[PDB]
Amino acid sequence: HHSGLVKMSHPSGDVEACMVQVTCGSMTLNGLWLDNTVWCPRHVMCPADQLSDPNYDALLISMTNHSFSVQKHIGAPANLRVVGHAMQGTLLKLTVDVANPSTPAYTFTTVKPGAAFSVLACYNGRPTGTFTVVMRPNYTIKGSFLCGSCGSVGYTKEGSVINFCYMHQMELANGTHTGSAFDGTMYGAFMDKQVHQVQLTDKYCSVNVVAWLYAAILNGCAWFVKPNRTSVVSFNEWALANQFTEFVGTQSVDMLAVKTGVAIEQLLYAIQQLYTGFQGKQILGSTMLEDEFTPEDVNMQIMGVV
Amino acid sequence: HHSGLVKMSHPSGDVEACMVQVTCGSMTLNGLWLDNTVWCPRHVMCPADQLSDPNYDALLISMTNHSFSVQKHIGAPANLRVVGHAMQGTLLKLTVDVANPSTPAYTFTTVKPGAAFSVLACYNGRPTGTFTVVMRPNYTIKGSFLCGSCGSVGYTKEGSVINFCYMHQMELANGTHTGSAFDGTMYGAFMDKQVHQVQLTDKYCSVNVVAWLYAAILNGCAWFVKPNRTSVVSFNEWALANQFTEFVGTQSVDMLAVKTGVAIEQLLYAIQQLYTGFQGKQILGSTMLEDEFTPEDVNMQIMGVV
Numbered sequence A, B: 001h002h003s004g005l006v007k008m009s010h011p012s013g014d015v016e017a018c019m020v021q022v023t024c025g026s027m028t029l030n031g032l033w034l035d036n037t038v039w040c041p042r043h044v045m046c047p048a049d050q051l052s053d054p055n056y057d058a059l060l061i062s063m064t065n066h067s068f069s070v071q072k073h074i075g076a077p078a079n080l081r082v083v084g085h086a087m088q089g090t091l092l093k094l095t096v097d098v099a100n101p102s103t104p105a106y107t108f109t110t111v112k113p114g115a116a117f118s119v120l121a122c123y124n125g126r127p128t129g130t131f132t133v134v135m136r137p138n139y140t141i142k143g144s145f146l147c148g149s150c151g152s153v154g155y156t157k158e159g160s161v162i163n164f165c166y167m168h169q170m171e172l173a174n175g176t177h178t179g180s181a182f183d184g185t186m187y188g189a190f191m192d193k194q195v196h197q198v199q200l201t202d203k204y205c206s207v208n209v210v211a212w213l214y215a216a217i218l219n220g221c222a223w224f225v226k227p228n229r230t231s232v233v234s235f236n237e238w239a240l241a242n243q244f245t246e247f248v249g250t251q252s253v254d255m256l257a258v259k260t261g262v263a264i265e266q267l268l269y270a271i272q273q274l275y276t277g278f279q280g281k282q283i284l285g286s287t288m289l290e291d292e293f294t295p296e297d298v299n300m301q302i303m304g305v306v
């Protein structure tokens, strides 16, 4: 029996119309053109043989408006004249003389651990694929990014409003990925320098494991549900010692509890038991806990509720 | 011997000139006036009788520009006419007919656990005090806020640029505080609703304990330094077992290591030993580890390095 869950991304057309190529010096990558602004990673300014220890303040000083070449290849091609340049954290903010006529309604937001967002993977200003990821508790994502992908963007959507939350910057030693928010901060404690960096431990996202167990119940799979319960406070004490995030309930989780008649505290108890082993059984085709589906994913994909 | 460390805030004058009072119906709090925008917490729209589960989308639709009353009290008083209103996350963005003539150079940024920022505490649009806090690992601050303080702002400063990072929203059960970033997200998993919320465990901020031990050494207090070392990898495994954040070194910590001649790993070992007990001894007047001073504080206040 199939769960009815897939890795679901937003439709990407609105964001496709905002992608451009940015070239500076010897480097090229992707940028995001919104209104009269093009956003891109600041390491486009770095000579390839200095990415280990750049002085970004000095690099920026050394640039003029004409140092940046901005090209839209998709749809109606365009070359955008840069009339101002600025740095915000790890991003460049290039002002251009033409407002993107396809700018969608949008905001900038930061994504939190356990939350899902959609990525539009781009190369040379050309979108090539889309996928969805969950921000991990150690502020990496398990993405799929190759050389030239920097400046690819991640986003959520509320109604018709695109909430941009991620701009790709780098790949870590363990194959995971991280990037910037559009306030210019890197996620987590990472820095946009080409050096090996301390990686924090990952954890299971407890809220998402609960959502997945609710998805199992919604599919008729509930052998792991017992009358036994673990309080949220007791679970969160246990989580600290056992590689789980602390559980914080939400209206989305509550909706799943009401629809199934299974209390959150029953599933917190179940998680504690399942973490010691599934004992030969499967849940939705898995023998390990799944934390890559959110409560919102389960509500939307199984119940049609947004 | 006094360490030379105090809790140091930025001079507040530039931010004082941006504070206003925002009133909606019978609710009032503070806002931040930059250019033609006033930022404030969206719960100013909520009747005191409905704060437990507000329908903020419906509340926003019910408002008109005339629903909001904005006054500047400090300096040259002004009554500011609202000409547009919108909501971003947990903040309102009110457009006013006058641009703040004292708008400083500014950006919006998010602050990370362990980082310090300055707070300007305001009541009824009038600044009353300033203090500094570190963002705790559980995304609370140990502040000093009473009824009417919402909309008080926190910020850092780089050169002449004010980086706004915090707008005050709420007090938690244990007396700590939290708020929003100016992308409208609440810090942590918190929600701007008047209901009990799960409080995540706090942790010691390792990078700041290291800074404080370097401050001790700079002041001639180094009895806890041994040849013994703990690697960053080993310490971080220990940290997860002992309620400490994982350590991620920075250029600022590195400068302290060079100035004192003591390696980070020697202090990581010392922390492990001191956490089991100071053995009746004191460090900079303390019998417990201190994590409220950053590496930058130590560099700036003791060595004069910004």
Ligand SMILES: *[C@H](O)[C@H](C[C@@H]1CCNC1=O)NC(=O)[C@H](CC(C)C)NC(=O)OC[C@@H]1CCC(=O)N1CCc1ccccc1
Binding pocket: B029, B043, B051, B145, B146, B147, B148, B149, B150, B151, B169, B170, B171, B172, B173, B177, B191, B192, B193, B194, B195, B196, B197
């Ligand atoms: C805004 O000025 C004000 C600032 C508060 C007031 C006291 N000190 C502060 O820092 N903020 C609010 O009034 C909040 C409004 C929400 C965001 C809609 N509410 C708030 O801070 O409530 C605090 C109280 C006391 C401690 C606590 O837990 N709560 C929430 C309600 C509660 C739930 C369960 C158990 C006990 C209390």
